[model samples]
Target chain A: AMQVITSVKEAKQIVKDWKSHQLSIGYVPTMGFLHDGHLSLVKHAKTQDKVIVSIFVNPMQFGPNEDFSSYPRDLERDIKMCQDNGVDMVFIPDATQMYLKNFSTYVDMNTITDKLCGAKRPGHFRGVCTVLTKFFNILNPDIVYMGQKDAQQCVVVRHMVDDLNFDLKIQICPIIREEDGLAKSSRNVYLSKEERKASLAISQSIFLAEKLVREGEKNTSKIIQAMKDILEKEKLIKIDYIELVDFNTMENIENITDNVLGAVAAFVGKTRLIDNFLVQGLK
Target chain B: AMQVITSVKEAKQIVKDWKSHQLSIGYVPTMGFLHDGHLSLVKHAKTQDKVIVSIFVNPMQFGPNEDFSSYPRDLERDIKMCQDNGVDMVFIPDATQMYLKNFSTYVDMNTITDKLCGAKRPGHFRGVCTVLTKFFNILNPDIVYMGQKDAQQCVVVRHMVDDLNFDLKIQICPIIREEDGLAKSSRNVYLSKEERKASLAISQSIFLAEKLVREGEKNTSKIIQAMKDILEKEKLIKIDYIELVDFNTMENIENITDNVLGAVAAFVGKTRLIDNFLVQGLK
Candidate 1:
């Protein structure tokens, strides 16, 4: 049997009681509208002694122009998916519940959060770090699972966990994707049929860039040009960023070294989608 | 059996395992040289399921002119007292271990810490909050014991605990005093016989002020002047502050109304000592 709790207070009590029994808890924090990607996280969490999946469409992470109001959420279906996926408990806290009135404290990182998506969306990573820290404190899980889909987010969180001395292990799961290679995301629902078809170019560009780098392409500019050519061909695909970066530091790399991450993000119509492929040990 | 843990890692492991068993842990944090004042806190901790006492003269709370380098320390005696008093663990993490090379995070309060002792000592409460937060995170205790000798410190810490949402209760033990009326303090080690005798005036002034307030003397100026006059009579005493403030807000009150605290601080020949007496609800 599974339990669904909408209150943070009740959820904290459940975790507190469960901890008394020496049960190890694994948590996967998400914004609802579950897909195979979310189920994969639940599958991973089930390996632990207990699993708690929290579905909260955090508004703090969005900018004034960002799509917070239009963010996809389906709590009823999200609960069903959690129940079917061996999740022991599902926490669906509302925005007000998660961030009560007079909530002024926040957790922020200075180094890693200053680059990539953080640079593009100011105060975005701070919001993510703050909300996730709050969740981590509330759940007090032994292990937390994150998808590689949010590559920069995983790195920032890892840095925060180590820096803050949080006594928990962070597990990074492989990104789950659709059959046609568009990375699975809740925002994928916002794409029209033509735009959805155009979004496939993002993953295609990443694959093309990876293939070029693998086939003796050492120049960073050449790899970027090849990927950019593919993305620009699609009228619906308005490129956000397509770059090669050092996998460890997330800094833009002049040349591929021991490990590099070629990441891509695009506006496939009104929906923003991202994808990345890690290349290790310099071919 | 009582254990003395010098490393934070070992202390946390022990506390974490105990917490798994649903044991209630009480913590008393002190800079060594244990006296009846510190022992009183330990006795309170013994009433709980498990007792964790930490003895570290935190350098963060000391200023350049403060006697941090000369702060009294007697670990051998401190450990014996803790063991005799039913303490389960005594953590004594060194400054290097508590503060890493890059440690920069700090916890602070907005208002109350800015008054009383906090006014005289800059960055003192920040250090207290940071270290206590670290200890609270590591020990994960159910309750923390503090002596009322450092009344401002206790109140400041309580504010930090409430503001930061540290899930622990603060039990402020009453001021332990000598028969002659000097409040028990580790700093008393710095005083000569004459200075110790002069310090008795600090407590005497507090007693007289409390009596005045009890006898319908509502004017703060009158109460403070009487306390200052008693301290001034002692040629060896250097008055730091003689304050009569509201107990709850820690603000200076023009007249005593309900629940006021008559607090005093003075240096008797180089040794700073504090004393206070409560004025219960309006007579």
Candidate 2:
């Protein structure tokens, strides 16, 4: 049965109880407003003796101009999702409670953050890394399950686990997609009926980029230009960014010298969205 | 039998074995060249079910011009000290093992670091914070021990633990000083015979500052001037800084109505040394 815990103090008791029984812990950290993508992660967590799902929309990850204020949150609906998924505990903490007034600590990176979404959104991964560091220490999970939906986040977080020597396994699950090839995201709710349909251009562009690379197209500019055409054709889609870079190095290259990542970010109105796919070989 | 483990994997295995029996893990993280100050912290950790002393002279915590390369290291002596102190495991890690080729993550705190030793040494606390974060994650102790000799560091690390909500309790031990009251430090090795005797100014200034505060001298500048006079009397002493500030807020106040820390740093012949004392309410 899923138990709702709002206090950090309350959550620690549950964690302590699990550890007493020598149970291996599994954690799924989410930004509330749970969806199929989040539920898919909990299903994986069920394999462990105790599963903890942290649902907090971290303000640190959002820029001043970003959607932190209007970001969807429904604790009522989220708790129900956790219950349905047979999750052991749901940790929903307030932002103010997480960061006291005197809070001034930050976990930031240098080199890897210079490319991709890290460039478009300054201090984004820094926020993610800080919040994750806090959660990992607070929860003390034996293993953590995360979706590959945010491919760059997956890569960045893995680096943190390795670099910081966090004693937990980061299991990256496959991206959960919709009936249409559109990847699942809670931000999908922000789209209007027409905007939702236009958003297909994002996933469609990724497929075209992936298919082009599969058919022996090694030139990055040609691949990017081809992807841009399909995206621009959708009048509603304002191209935020589209690039091909080495997934590991996060460095943009003119040619596919390594396993490349064709990533996309766009706005189908005021609400911005992101999508990505990795391509192999051809080096 | 005490074991000296160099591999991170082997250390984790020892931690895992101790934890499997539900033993409470205690940790003492220190740079190499074990001193009485470092062993005092381990003595506190001895009360726990298992004691792990991590001895690595972290390169990150030293400024480019500081004594990183020149810092003292004695692995055999360090292991002997840990074994004598009844430490279950002594973890000694290499610099390359702690940091990878593309390592970029940093844990930095603001406001507090802008004063005292942190002001004199840029990127010093960032190195300390980053290395400590890695150790805390790798060790997973129920409680970790530290020394109040590094009074600012004592306060800063407590703030990090509180802000980040790490489950482990931070146990702070008081400064273990020399017979003449000089704070025990491995860097004392840098002091020449006469310079070592002159270095008493570092601790003496702290005693004078504390005495003035105890006798109702409320003016910050008055307290600072009196402390400076005593330190300047020693020809070898080069004043780095002498500060009187609120410990929690780390802010300089015009007068002390409550508890305050009078911190001192000086170059007593080439090797910079620091000392501090906390003053209670005027009585």
Candidate 3:
């Protein structure tokens, strides 16, 4: 039996009951418009005694100029998807329930948040950390499943949990990609026919960087240039950033010393697309 | 048996075991050098099946000029007080354990934090919120005990708990004062005999203002002036801020139509002292 809980109190009550019974809960937080990427997370969440999926398209994460109003949402389909995937509960709280009158508290991370997507999108990780803090508190899940597709988010959230001493495990699952090698994302729908084809350059650059790293290429600048050339070939694609950074710090490295992340962000026509691949160095 | 645990892991493990037995935990967070005010909180905490008292004089809350190094601490006496007061556990984590290297994450509250003690002491509540968040997550207490002596701290913490959806109740106990009417505080030890006498002006001003409000005085500036006149009479006392603000919003109000907090901060010699009294407005 699945419960579609909209109230925070009711959701907490269910989680409390489960915890009292010594059942472990796994959570998957999403903004709805679920694709196979979300399903993969749900599939992992099913390993726990209970699974809770929350579908809240957070307004705080979007800037004034960004597509907050047009962000995809279909609760009916989202609930159905959770039900089909054996999710025990779906927490779909509205913006009002999430943020009350005169809500001004924020969880902010420095250093690591000053680079890549964090720099490109101001106040983005602050929103991510704040809402996730709320969700972690409300749901009290034993483990939270997240996709590596949002690689920076994974790192930032993990740091917040550790820094704040959140008593839960953050399991970063592998990125779920499409048959065409483009990373599965809800925003993929924003791409046009020609733009969708051009989006392959984002993944191609990541794959190229990963391949270069594997074949003893340590120079980050050289690999970055190679990625830039690939993305530049597509007239419809405009490169946002293509850099190799230390995985944990998210700081650009001249050479890959430890674990490194080769990440790329580009504008496929008007829709922005991001893709990344992680590689481990010799320990 | 009362356990004095310094390890975050050991403390959490004990708390986990207690929750497994369906025992409710009441937490009292403090900066050691136990006073009657802290004992009052512990007295309320005794209602729960278990009580955890964390005594870490958080350095993050103190400014560079503030007395972080000279902050009073007595582990042996603190342990004895906990033992005598029926405390189930005392979690005294060192600064290193609480803040790891590159601990850049902070819980920041806006608007309300920009006034009163927050304005005076920068990054104060940020430290308070961050430490409490760690305690709440690590201990998983059903209720948290706080004293109204730090009145603005009570308001700020409550807002943080509500805003972040921390799953716990904040029990704000009454401000415990000495027979001399001076509010009990850890920093009271910093005062010399003459300075201690000067500190009486703090509580006297608070008491006089409470009387004015009770006698149906509605004008804020008049009330502020009367309070200021009392402090000015004491040559050794230097006034910091004497504010009458809405209890919830911490905003200055001309007339008290709802709950208001009459808060005062002053320097006796070189030591700063704070005292406050909460009054219910005509509802």
Name the best candidate (by DockQ): 3
Write the residue-wise lDDT of candidate 1 on B137-173 in tens digits. 7888889999877777887777655544556799988
Ranking by DockQ: 3, 2, 1
* Chain B TM-scores of the candidates: 0.97, 0.96, 0.98
The order by descending TM-score is: 3, 2, 1
Give the per-residue lDDT digits (tens) of candidate 1, residues A1-283.
8889988778889998897787999999998889999889888988899999988888878899889999887788888888888898888878777765535545565576666677878878877876776788778899999999899998888766655566788898998989999899999999999998988889898889888888867778888898899899999988888878887678898877677788887888777788998788875
> Which stretches of model 3 miss by more than 4 angstroms?
B281-283
Per-residue lDDT of candidate 2, residues B223-249 (tens digit): 899988898899999998888888887
Instruction: Please tell me what DockQ candidate 1 reaches.
Output: 0.18
Higher-scoring candidate on TM-score, 2 or 3? 3
Task: Report the lDDT tens digits of candidate 3 across residue range B1-283.
Answer: 7888989899889999998899999999999999999999999999999989999999889999788989998899999999998999999999899899989899988878889999999989889988888889888999999998887888888889999999889989999999999999989998888888888988898999999888788898999999998899888898889999998888999987866799998888878889988997466
Cα RMSD, model 2: 1.7
Q: Give each prediction's DockQ, rounded to 2 decimals.
A: 0.18, 0.83, 0.90
Q: Model 1, residue A140: what's the lDDT?
A: 86
Better of 2 and 3 by DockQ: 3
Weakest lDDT window of 10 consecutive positions for candidate 1 chain B: B101-110
TM-score of each candidate structure, all chains considered together = 0.81, 0.96, 0.98
